[PDB]
Amino acid sequence: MNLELDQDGHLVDYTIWNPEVAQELAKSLDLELTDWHFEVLAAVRQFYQQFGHSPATRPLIKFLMKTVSPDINNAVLQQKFNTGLVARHLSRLAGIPKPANCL
Numbered sequence: 708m709n710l711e712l713d714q715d716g717h718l719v720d721y722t723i724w725n726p727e728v729a730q731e732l733a734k735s736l737d738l739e740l741t742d743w744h745f746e747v748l749a750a751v752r753q754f755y756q757q758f759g760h761s762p763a764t765r766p767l768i769k770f771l772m773k774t775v776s777p778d779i780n781n782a783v784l785q786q787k788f789n790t791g792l793v794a795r796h797l798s799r800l801a802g803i804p805k806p807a808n809c810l
Contacts, residue, residue: 715805717798721755724802732800736789743787744800750774751801761798761806768793 708731711719716732718724729748730740738744754762754770762770764781771779784793788800795809 713804715799715809717804718802721752721802721804724752728802729800732802736796738789740800747771747775747779747784747787747797748801751797752803755801755803761803762794763806763808764794767797 708728710728710731711723713719716735718728718732726740726745729745733740733744740748750771751762751767753774754767768779768781768784771784781793784797785791788796790796792809794806798804798806
């Protein structure tokens with residue numbers, strides 16, 4: 708798969724995302740996506756569609772709690788996504804740009 712990526716490794720064009728593209732991006736985390744991840748990534752894309760930018764760490768967690776499940780928190784996301792860089796990689800795997808203040 709030959710994805711068109713920006714300097715951060717995020718999709719240039721969020722509209723070409725699909726579950727196979729998400730899995731391609733998740734390979735760098737040695738992460739096999741399941742429906743659990745697909746539902747979380749759908750909410751990340753919903754945030755982007757509603758508000759036009761990628762969510763930062765705390766707003767991302769709050770939005771997932773409201774939209775997906777109150778049981779989602781940073782620790783759960785870190786475990787399920789194989790990374791402590793939750794805002795960065797949730798946006799990346801959802802096909803949206805890097806949140807502005809990430810390194």
